[PDB]
Design a protein around this ligand. Sequence first.
Ligand SMILES: CC(=O)COc1cc2cc(c1)C(=O)N[C@H]([C@H](O)CNCc1cccc(C(C)C)c1)Cc1cccc(c1)OCCCCO2
Length: 377
Amino acid sequence: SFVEMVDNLRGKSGQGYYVEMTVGSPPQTLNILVDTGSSNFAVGAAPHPFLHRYYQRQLSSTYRDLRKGVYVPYTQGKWEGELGTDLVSIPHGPNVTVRANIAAITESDKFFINGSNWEGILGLAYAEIARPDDSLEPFFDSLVKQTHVPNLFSLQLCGASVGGSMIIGGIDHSLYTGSLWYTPIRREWYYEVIIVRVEINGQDLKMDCKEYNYDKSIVDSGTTNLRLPKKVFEAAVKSIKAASSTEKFPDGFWLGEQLVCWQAGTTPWNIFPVISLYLMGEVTNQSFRITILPQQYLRPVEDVATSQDDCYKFAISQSSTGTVMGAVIMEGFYVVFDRARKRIGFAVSACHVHDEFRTAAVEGPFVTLDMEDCGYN
Ligand SMILES: CC(=O)COc1cc2cc(c1)C(=O)N[C@H]([C@H](O)CNCc1cccc(C(C)C)c1)Cc1cccc(c1)OCCCCO2
């Protein structure tokens, strides 16, 4: 019954992917950001300049107040609000209704994005990182516990405005080609994984693999960029600069601040390298890799001039909180969050990226010794 969930996600480039949900009785319809990088279900519940609608608890006969406040600080933005529960449904999802925790946002700071068309956030990660603490059951745990929906979901994020699929409760084989490759979920808080090797244009970055996961590596549909720890980011930017030195760019471009533009249809894709991330596999000493094309980490953006050029932002940036495999990394692929088996699956997506001499790929097996040394402690 998964065909009803294909193409149930929408978005704008760099403003997140959202799914339509309803809360309350009678149903109030809201667009909810799909975020595997957090664990709180939260919606606008008070007027805001960027909100076109919001949750009105007074109009819901099933609303229950929890008489507890809550605040969430993300890497970008923060909000505070009041906790409660209400009935929730996903129109283009499973045909069920769950009573779920809902944080009603009353104040926020650089959280809602002007023109993104979503009004709330659906944190799909685990209770351990829920606010105010791990006793607030996340939505997906409530869904699995109150229905027969199997304990997994999959995300097909399609690039540039944008669309995709969230298959709730299973895997839809028409959304990917080739084999699924699985990496263990290292610990159930974020969707934490272990990166064991990094290559740029086939050259190993030759860093101690601990650097790749200092202090963690997560799969996060709620973050746009590939974010890398300082030492790793510097190494990768140096390698990407050298591969593209045929042309030179402002240093503000390499920091994500300024665009780069080219005459429409003349983007020099071939001078930007491919990035290969090797992930811990399912059997001893075995890994696999996902290969990222520049069409993923050069994010297309609106024209800042009176021209019809093709303009891009560098979508790799620095982090002080570990590696973040953001939406730009996920866009090539079908990503299976197999919570039941504590693993994350990767396969080439049906909406894969098209370079003309190169292709995004998921390839294995590879042999990698001492993979467990790559995890940070
Ligand atoms: C250019 C870049 O890419 C820079 O960095 C970015 C960019 C970015 C969002 C985040 C970070 C962001 O913070 N996104 C969080 C995720 O949940 C974060 N996950 C990890 C995390 C970090 C800190 C604390 C927690 C707790 C709550 C568990 C979790 C979710 C989120 C918050 C606010 C707006 C969002 C989406 O709009 C979606 C469109 C993308 C917005 O662009």
